[PDB]
Design an enzyme around this catalytic site. Sequence first.
Site, PDB file in Angstrom:
ATOM      1  N   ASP A   1      10.074   0.883  -1.470  1.00 46.54           N
ATOM      2  CA  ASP A   1       9.381   1.442  -2.635  1.00 46.54           C
ATOM      3  C   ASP A   1       9.781   2.893  -2.914  1.00 46.54           C
ATOM      4  O   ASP A   1       9.201   3.842  -2.348  1.00 46.54           O
ATOM      5  CB  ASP A   1       7.880   1.357  -2.384  1.00 46.54           C
ATOM      6  CG  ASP A   1       7.066   1.458  -3.633  1.00 46.54           C
ATOM      7  OD1 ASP A   1       7.617   1.802  -4.694  1.00 46.54           O
ATOM      8  OD2 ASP A   1       5.852   1.205  -3.522  1.00 46.54           O
ATOM      9  N   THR A   2      10.763   3.052  -3.805  1.00 49.32           N
ATOM     10  CA  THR A   2      11.226   4.376  -4.227  1.00 49.32           C
ATOM     11  C   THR A   2      10.189   5.065  -5.119  1.00 49.32           C
ATOM     12  O   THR A   2      10.212   6.275  -5.313  1.00 49.32           O
ATOM     13  CB  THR A   2      12.581   4.284  -4.971  1.00 49.32           C
ATOM     14  OG1 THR A   2      12.458   3.480  -6.156  1.00 49.32           O
ATOM     15  CG2 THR A   2      13.686   3.711  -4.051  1.00 49.32           C
ATOM     16  N   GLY A   3       9.250   4.304  -5.660  1.00 52.64           N
ATOM     17  CA  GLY A   3       8.138   4.925  -6.394  1.00 52.64           C
ATOM     18  C   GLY A   3       6.990   5.448  -5.549  1.00 52.64           C
ATOM     19  O   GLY A   3       6.022   5.949  -6.105  1.00 52.64           O
TER      20      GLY A   3
HETATM   21  C1  LIG Z   1       3.079  -6.337  -8.914  1.00 49.64           C
HETATM   22  O1  LIG Z   1       2.497  -5.032  -9.001  1.00 49.64           O
HETATM   23  C2  LIG Z   1       3.344  -3.883  -9.219  1.00 49.64           C
HETATM   24  O2  LIG Z   1       4.554  -4.026  -9.168  1.00 49.64           O
HETATM   25  N1  LIG Z   1       2.729  -2.737  -9.482  1.00 49.64           N
HETATM   26  C3  LIG Z   1       3.429  -1.487  -9.722  1.00 49.64           C
HETATM   27  C4  LIG Z   1       2.967  -0.489  -8.684  1.00 49.64           C
HETATM   28  O3  LIG Z   1       1.864   0.006  -8.756  1.00 49.64           O
HETATM   29  N2  LIG Z   1       3.812  -0.236  -7.684  1.00 49.64           N
HETATM   30  C5  LIG Z   1       3.528   0.634  -6.546  1.00 49.64           C
HETATM   31  C6  LIG Z   1       3.586  -0.251  -5.298  1.00 49.64           C
HETATM   32  C7  LIG Z   1       2.679  -1.468  -5.383  1.00 49.64           C
HETATM   33  C8  LIG Z   1       3.209  -2.744  -5.556  1.00 49.64           C
HETATM   34  C9  LIG Z   1       2.383  -3.870  -5.627  1.00 49.64           C
HETATM   35  C10 LIG Z   1       1.009  -3.724  -5.534  1.00 49.64           C
HETATM   36  C11 LIG Z   1       0.470  -2.452  -5.353  1.00 49.64           C
HETATM   37  C12 LIG Z   1       1.300  -1.337  -5.276  1.00 49.64           C
HETATM   38  C13 LIG Z   1       4.547   1.776  -6.488  1.00 49.64           C
HETATM   39  O4  LIG Z   1       5.886   1.346  -6.489  1.00 49.64           O
HETATM   40  C14 LIG Z   1       4.440   2.722  -7.680  1.00 49.64           C
HETATM   41  N3  LIG Z   1       3.169   3.422  -7.499  1.00 49.64           N
HETATM   42  C15 LIG Z   1       2.598   3.877  -8.768  1.00 49.64           C
HETATM   43  C16 LIG Z   1       2.507   5.378  -8.917  1.00 49.64           C
HETATM   44  C17 LIG Z   1       3.524   6.108  -8.784  1.00 49.64           C
HETATM   45  C18 LIG Z   1       3.464   7.289  -8.880  1.00 49.64           C
HETATM   46  C19 LIG Z   1       2.396   7.920  -9.143  1.00 49.64           C
HETATM   47  C20 LIG Z   1       2.451   9.412  -9.293  1.00 49.64           C
HETATM   48  C21 LIG Z   1       1.293  10.184  -9.353  1.00 49.64           C
HETATM   49  C22 LIG Z   1       1.390  11.559  -9.498  1.00 49.64           C
HETATM   50  C23 LIG Z   1       2.648  12.140  -9.594  1.00 49.64           C
HETATM   51  C24 LIG Z   1       3.779  11.331  -9.564  1.00 49.64           C
HETATM   52  N4  LIG Z   1       3.662  10.005  -9.414  1.00 49.64           N
HETATM   53  C25 LIG Z   1       1.256   7.245  -9.340  1.00 49.64           C
HETATM   54  C26 LIG Z   1       1.321   5.930  -9.217  1.00 49.64           C
HETATM   55  N5  LIG Z   1       3.211   4.310  -6.508  1.00 49.64           N
HETATM   56  C27 LIG Z   1       2.132   4.535  -5.769  1.00 49.64           C
HETATM   57  O5  LIG Z   1       1.107   3.912  -5.999  1.00 49.64           O
HETATM   58  C28 LIG Z   1       2.284   5.573  -4.676  1.00 49.64           C
HETATM   59  N6  LIG Z   1       1.868   6.881  -5.127  1.00 49.64           N
HETATM   60  C29 LIG Z   1       2.614   7.983  -5.081  1.00 49.64           C
HETATM   61  O6  LIG Z   1       3.728   8.034  -4.595  1.00 49.64           O
HETATM   62  O7  LIG Z   1       2.019   9.124  -5.746  1.00 49.64           O
HETATM   63  C30 LIG Z   1       2.566  10.449  -5.772  1.00 49.64           C
HETATM   64  C31 LIG Z   1       1.575   5.272  -3.354  1.00 49.64           C
HETATM   65  C32 LIG Z   1       1.955   3.870  -2.895  1.00 49.64           C
HETATM   66  C33 LIG Z   1       2.092   6.232  -2.273  1.00 49.64           C
HETATM   67  C34 LIG Z   1       0.054   5.441  -3.495  1.00 49.64           C
HETATM   68  C35 LIG Z   1       3.349  -1.069 -11.208  1.00 49.64           C
HETATM   69  C36 LIG Z   1       1.923  -1.085 -11.782  1.00 49.64           C
HETATM   70  C37 LIG Z   1       3.904   0.356 -11.312  1.00 49.64           C
HETATM   71  C38 LIG Z   1       4.214  -2.018 -12.057  1.00 49.64           C
END
Ligand SMILES: COC(=O)N[C@H](C(=O)N[C@@H](Cc1ccccc1)[C@@H](O)CN(Cc1ccc(-c2ccccn2)cc1)NC(=O)[C@@H](NC(=O)OC)C(C)(C)C)C(C)(C)C
EC number: 3.4.23.16
Lengths: 99, 99
Positions: free
Chosen positions: B25-27
């Site tokens: 997860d690069t996000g």
């Molecule tokens: C099938 O579901 C998904 O693919 N859900 C995706 C999703 O939420 N992916 C998450 C991982 C995930 C997959 C499946 C179920 C639940 C979660 C991440 O790839 C993207 N996500 C979504 C996201 C990304 C970035 C941010 C963010 C917030 C402030 C500043 C910059 N970025 C907020 C939410 N990142 C985060 O939630 C991370 N947050 C983070 O790194 O925050 C700094 C966590 C993990 C460390 C909490 C989307 C809604 C984006 C399509």
Amino acid sequence: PQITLWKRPLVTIRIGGQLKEALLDTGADDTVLEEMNLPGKWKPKMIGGLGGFIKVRQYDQIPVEICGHKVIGTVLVGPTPVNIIGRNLLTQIGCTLNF
Amino acid sequence: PQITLWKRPLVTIRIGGQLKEALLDTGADDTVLEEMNLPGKWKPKMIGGLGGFIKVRQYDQIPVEICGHKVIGTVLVGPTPVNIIGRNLLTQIGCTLNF
Ligand SMILES: COC(=O)N[C@H](C(=O)N[C@@H](Cc1ccccc1)[C@@H](O)CN(Cc1ccc(-c2ccccn2)cc1)NC(=O)[C@@H](NC(=O)OC)C(C)(C)C)C(C)(C)C
């Protein structure tokens, strides 16, 4: 290019001649952009990660430019903390994870 | 490997004799695992997903194995739907995004 992950993989994208910063996200099924008007029909959708789901608008066949790469596909628009290029668009530019 | 994103980049992780499925997860800034007991002290953190924040327990210097790559770093434990390998451990295995 080959890009590091010591920092968040933020890139500049172009949509409707809007310049926006977005996250390249291998953990995202979908592409989700912060609130913006896009023309055309859209359908309501929910998407989720950690913390819960959000309601978004689903626009199909939207052109986007990602680092000089012109793709078209599905864009979700809603209350995302940050713009996110998910795998639907990453795929379209031949983006891979490598180690 | 060179991992396409045509599907979710799910891999095996080993953590303390436990084998688990996890998403590259690069996000994700952080690595977040679903509920489990880990040895050692821990601090509460709050992390923010798409729907809002969850509270987790932060464990430091936890050895983790990703595709038989031996890694040691911070592991957050709490209410995630899926085991998430974030950038803190992706950088440790030399992971890049390529396109
Ligand atoms: C099938 O579901 C998904 O693919 N859900 C995706 C999703 O939420 N992916 C998450 C991982 C995930 C997959 C499946 C179920 C639940 C979660 C991440 O790839 C993207 N996500 C979504 C996201 C990304 C970035 C941010 C963010 C917030 C402030 C500043 C910059 N970025 C907020 C939410 N990142 C985060 O939630 C991370 N947050 C983070 O790194 O925050 C700094 C966590 C993990 C460390 C909490 C989307 C809604 C984006 C399509």
